[PDB]
Amino acid sequence: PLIVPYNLPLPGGVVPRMLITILGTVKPNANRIALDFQRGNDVAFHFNPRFNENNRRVIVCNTKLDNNWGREERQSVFPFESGKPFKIQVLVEPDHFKVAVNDAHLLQYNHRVKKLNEISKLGISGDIDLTSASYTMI
Numbered sequence: 001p002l003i004v005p006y007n008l009p010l011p012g013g014v015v016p017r018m019l020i021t022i023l024g025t026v027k028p029n030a031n032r033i034a035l036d037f038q039r040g041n042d043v044a045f046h047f048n049p050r051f052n053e054n055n056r057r058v059i060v061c062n063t064k065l066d067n068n069w070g071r072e073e074r075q076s077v078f079p080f081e082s083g084k085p086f087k088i089q090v091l092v093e094p095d096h097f098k099v100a101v102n103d104a105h106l107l108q109y110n111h112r113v114k115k116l117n118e119i120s121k122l123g124i125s126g127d128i129d130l131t132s133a134s135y136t137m138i
């Protein structure tokens with residue numbers, strides 16, 4: 001187990017068939033979780049579970065370019081529960097990131113940042129106890 005915030009290096013960036021697995025437990029009374037796939041200061045893919053946005057649970061995804069957030073993609077399907085162990089899997093495909101939680105498909109996010117081989121860091125932050133962060137090629 002690791003203390004958040006945690007930075008997982010992605011040397012030479014990401015590539016199709018790369019499967020990133022994040023294991024942990026959501027804290028009790030969690031407010032937020034964030035995964036940030038970064039290309040330098042740009043955030044290619046921000047994955048942001050919010051547990052109380054106007055008393056609703058929502059997944060927010062976005063990209064940050066030149067320090068500016070773009071158009072949010074939102075999902076009401078919310079597989080996380082406070083206090084419970086989770087597995088987030090991000091599968092890199094040619095045209096999108098595919099996300100599954102606890103072995104159930106959640107969403108896809110089309111690549112806005114095109115240079116996959118420069119997306120060289122994954123930041124993990126928010127209201128979790130982080131057990132592990134690793135990747136493999138499927």
Ligand SMILES: CO[C@@H]1[C@@H](n2cc(-c3ccc(Cl)c(F)c3F)nn2)[C@@H](O)[C@@H](CO)O[C@@H]1Cc1cn(C2(C(F)F)COC2)nn1
Nearest residue numbers: 032033034046048060061062068069070071072125126127
């Ligand atoms: C409150 O900041 C968040 C941003 N955010 C979260 C974290 C964050 C830090 C620490 C932790 Cl531990 C953690 F979990 C975290 F989510 N940092 N930045 C990020 O979630 C962003 C996603 O779109 O939304 C917000 C910023 C934002 C959105 N927008 C609009 C458009 F441009 F997107 C939507 O109408 C205009 N303008 N600004």
Ligand SMILES: [Cl-]
Nearest residue numbers: 004005125126
């Ligand atoms: Cl944090």
